[PDB]
């Protein structure tokens, strides 16, 4: 049901942890999702940009969606990232994702092989009838900014829950004043987005580390001091393109193995030492896991091309 | 070998034509490649952006590469587009494409899931050892500008044939003054790139329509007035994102069926009528095929999502 | 848990119904599984021989397993047919099947590319540690009879629940007297298997049609008159190789569309008219669905090669 | 064309050799194919039962077919094993194999998921129109004997080159007396099949080891005493199911690494010592490779499940 999706305020784009041969580490993944549920996250994106959906084959991606539904689906909404630059793959992945029980789909506009606005309506109308859907706009990654007029045409459809918008707060405000539900896709704008520009909440990378504090930020009212205490951590997470930062941090916290699927590689030791300092300044009690944060050596990280 | 790739001036990024149910039309495709050869095209990109590689399953893509080598590889250089935003996919695709006899690989940087410069080097080093390689920079589509210092680093590998560059002539000139071979990836700049900025030639969309005129433009010296005559056709071809124009034009000339794989959809009737006038203005004798150019009705087009 | 698997007496090898384009018809499939649960079936095999697992790609097979777990897993045991003649595919399919929540795996010995008894131990030891497993012996289909000494070596493993045995009642008796749990794989021997030769129950094709009567046969004591009332129906179901008969019958009952994935084709009209007679003789009230049985025309059946 | 396939007498079902991690060893493979050509083998089956097609993903299989055509197709006929128990897979594999330039297809009847005779005709008619085809009957592996009346029906299609027959010489003679071309698929019968029962030649495992002697046996007339000399080697090659013997022997001769994809595992040391004596008895000069034959230690072998 679309209404239940519209009501979510804190959705985590969860990291996908790996075994040293490159396969998914499901035991670490289950720990991560349980920690999200214990700290009040309401939805998870499975295999989103942060979860490296772009590196998965479809069988391991549908497996990870079905696993998340089967183990956690009664305790958290499971939103499968089933969009694609290929309409055929978007159709196939979305209907299989809904068949294994996911609650909603996250759909990006076709990236790299971008299409016309007419082709973009055709793409989205291919999948929207399948179930509750959030459309995702991030032109810095896709090469194409979805214009609001396209979203307005698509919200005829009762399955469009709303938009994950990365353009910025002026675009968030244009949508929310036109009655479209919006989740900020930018951790470092989401507090203002929520309290000043009518956003419902955030689909977050930073909640992978501090899910309790992100929930506080979206639920307890304007808190501009909590916000600026999180800003240095947010900057660190985006120093190189996401998920490089989160992959590095979860490995330092010991909740994920230091295993990267290429083309991602970790942040260097100088940044890893800043992370040890950030954990101390914010307080280890707010971060996921209970192990002592480690700096790690560069040689701890396994970079895998063939898996 | 690499030197033979570096010598190519006219490389057509060939359109992939379809049967009425979405499968590849190999008879139409073979007609296109033969026409290219007969008009002096010296290389083809198989399954590039123009060839909708992004919409192919890997089995039909490797099949199209091996078929092109088997039928035409003694008459034209066959360059497989075996790049990906996933290093795993780029490694497998590339080694398999070389195993079936392609002469070179085209490698884009990771789009959408963009990585750090260090990750970008690791990605390209994963495939550069496999055979002659052209690196493709198109930040308008990928979200990321490959910096010259990464190219200078990678050019130490003797398998780097050069770069397909879309940033513009000032970037072309920075490479070519330093000894890196460049093909312009922008048809509307390629004449000046070739004669004024040291580009070896072009990896062209427009050559799918007027391969003889593109050949003349790359070999017979500066000719502003020929260039000026082609600019309106080139503008039309990129009115919407490629390959929407070329797919519409080739259906109008009768050399490809009017079948689109989504998310691409044809240009509207007013643009198709403009194309009929472009062909008459330039001269039908310069365009591929023998059939009279047609406007086509909207109803002639078949759009396919499930294939 | 293996003990819970050992205790099952009536497992249905459920048919996989199709839409006219060849995709799975999940709405019909859900009706079928609900009807099994309402008539007391205790387990279902998903994508077994009867379910045409051999014709599925792995993504649709894992999807169908995850779907069955998510919709029915609290009401019936879900046993994924994840075995293969390739050890690599067996490993991959089994661990993904268990990850989406299936309760057990059905594993055939490598068919067609058969291996030595030493290779067969190596194959099974690759997957047995993954969770509760039933080994399936059907030399009439595989070309290789698994010798009891191999099963005895493998029952060291607490995950081996038992064997689905198709060789016949003398082989069932050799296993059960040696303390191996056995499910008869032959509907027309399963009554004697159960009451005279120590079999626990049956993994059945016939239960797809008359699940209530098959449950009666396995639970209520020796009933040789009920058995011989079912014998003509059982013979009909195996007149050509299974699943040809069941696919034809479910279409006649209107619970499945008359759509066959090749290489299967339906029984001819003379056999379909015998089925109408069998339903009347046994009583429509005992068969799945509520629609009036139809003979169907040959032209009702859609035979699909490309899907 | 078909006539050129019908003329072949010596077809080697080539072994597929592996690198230490399970990937294909193309350098070893190319050495094997060159040795076959140099000893007068006239065709190769790529990825047949002997070549472990059953263990390949389709991408590596089409790659191996296109590679063989690209490197050797001007010197030897390349027959792809593109058959399957799934018609969908047989259709796709076969059309793609012909598109990359294979000269013929080898098609087994559906094994394990066996179908009715009518279904069997529908399966083969799905692929026979695609190019020259050899039908493979091996009921010991498939569970089903293709009846002569199905072959007589299918031979009306001019693309049927003939049959690889394993039932024995009486079945060979029934075909050949009626004008159907037969290759014996049984090495230990092929001499008599060739000279006494009208077989055109052999699709051979033993030719991977002694291709010159197999050629002599197929071209230079009856020679019982040469045949008798090879029988012990042929017996050894099928002591366990093929390809276990040939994979062990080629590792002992040094022309393939001692790497097995599961579920195959090497013959034990006593059989390997017997092989060293067979080579000495027949003469090393007749066996492929130049290196001294070795027994190998059990520890030299690498068995791989995950690759
Ligand atoms: Na804590
Ligand atoms: Na914690
Ligand atoms: Na120049
Ligand atoms: Na012309
Ligand atoms: Na022309
Ligand atoms: Na009833
Ligand atoms: Na009923
Ligand atoms: Na003869
Ligand atoms: Na020799
Ligand atoms: Na030799």
Numbering used by the authors:
A (entry chain A), B (entry chain B), C (entry chain A), D (entry chain B): 59 to 365
From the paper:
In plants, DHDPS is inhibited by lysine, and thus is a key enzyme in regulating lysine biosynthesis. The active site is located at the centre of a (β/α)8-barrel in each monomer, with the lysine binding site located in a cleft at the tight-dimer interface.
In order to further study the structure of plant DHDPS, crystals were obtained for a truncated form of the At-DHDPS2 protein in both the unliganded form, and with (S)-lysine bound at the allosteric regulation site. The crystals diffracted to 2.0 and 2.2 Å respectively, which is much greater resolution than the structure previously reported for Ns-DHDPS. The general arrangement of the At-DHDPS2 subunits is identical to that previously reported for N. sylvestris DHDPS and V. vinifera DHDPS, in which the enzyme exists as a dimer of dimers. Analysis of the structure using the EBI PISA server showed an extensive dimer interface (1800 Å2, 15.5% of the total monomer surface), and a smaller interface between the dimers (609 Å2, 4.6% of the total monomer surface). Consistent with these previous studies, our results show that this configuration may be a general feature of plant DHDPS enzymes. An overlay of the (S)-lysine bound and unbound structures showed a surprisingly low difference between the structures, with Cα RMSDs of only 0.29 Å and 0.30 for the superposition of the tight-dimers (i.e. the crystallographic asymmetrical unit) and the authentic tetramers, respectively. The scattering data were compared to the theoretical scattering calculated from the crystal structure, and showed good agreement at low q (q <0.12 Å) corresponding to the overall shape for both the unliganded enzyme (χ = 0.91) and enzyme bound to (S)-lysine (χ = 1.20). The experimental scattering profile of At-DHDPS2 was unchanged by the addition of (S)-lysine or the substrate, pyruvate, showing that there are no large conformational changes in solution caused by ligand binding.
